[PDB]
């Protein structure tokens, strides 16, 4: 276990090194034109998420069917947490891509969407409130990948422990009091439950979209959705 013997400091750097790139929308509005852009975008992000996941410590140890399960479980949660991250310094807006910045009422296009919109904006606001750091974020994102599919199956937990240690050392380094440390850690883990909820709602409106034939989904996306 190479990932088990990393310092907090070299854990944070790997995660940082492995951050996926920001992609552009193929943007040039309708329920269909919205879901197209979003589908096209998601579809290309997934490809990089897979690369990123492969660079997450401990992940590459697991078997292939294990890594598969973890990804088909986590994928929309991972996209959404990346969306909220990207969207932080745009109050009231969601930045899908540098060239694709939506405000809430571009949502009303797609019954299903304003509800989730608002869930994501509240999370965005929350992350801004606590002033999430990029270092804490890459940790958050890895917990999500490693936790989200863990029980729907020891090493994973070992890894999740390191990630917790990392998280705490960053808070100590930021100057947080020991009491502040565990309250912050906690309120961040508490947000994961909101991300999961948001992902479950999104997965479901997505499935109704596939069924109403609003847009064609990519083959990778059919496989992902199918898993749920």
């Amino acid at each position: 276990s190479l990932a088990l013997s990393l310092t907090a400091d070299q854990m944070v750097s790997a995660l940082l090194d492995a951050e996926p790139p920001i992609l552009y929308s193929e943007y040039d509005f309708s329920e269909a034109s919205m879901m197209g852009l979003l589908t096209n975008l998601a579809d290309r992000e997934l490809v990089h998420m897979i690369n990123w996941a492969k660079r997450v410590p401990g992940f590459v140890d697991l078997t292939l069917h294990d890594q598969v399960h973890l990804l088909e479980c986590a994928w929309l949660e991972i996209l959404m947490i990346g969306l909220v991250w990207r969207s932080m310094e745009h109050p009231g807006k969601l930045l899908f891509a540098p060239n694709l910045l939506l405000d809430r009422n571009q949502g009303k296009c797609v019954e299903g969407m304003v509800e989730i919109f608002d869930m994501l904006l509240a999370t965005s606001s929350r992350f801004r409130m606590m002033n999430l750091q990029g270092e804490e974020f890459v940790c958050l994102k890895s917990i999500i990948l490693l936790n989200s599919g863990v029980y729907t199956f020891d090493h994973i937990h070992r890894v999740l422990d390191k990630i917790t240690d990392t998280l705490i050392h960053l808070m100590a380094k930021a100057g947080l009091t020991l009491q502040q440390q565990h309250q912050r850690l906690a309120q961040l883990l508490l947000i994961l439950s909101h991300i999961r909820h948001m992902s479950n709602k999104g997965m479901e409106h997505l499935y109704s979209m596939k069924c109403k034939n609003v847009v064609p989904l990519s083959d990778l996306l059919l496989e992902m959705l199918d898993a749920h």
Binding site: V47, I50, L64, L71, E72, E223, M224
Partner: peptide
């Protein structure tokens, strides 16, 4: 033959 297998395998 699922795409997810393929993309992970490299």
């Amino acid at each position: 033959h699922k795409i997810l297998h393929r993309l992970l395998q490299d």
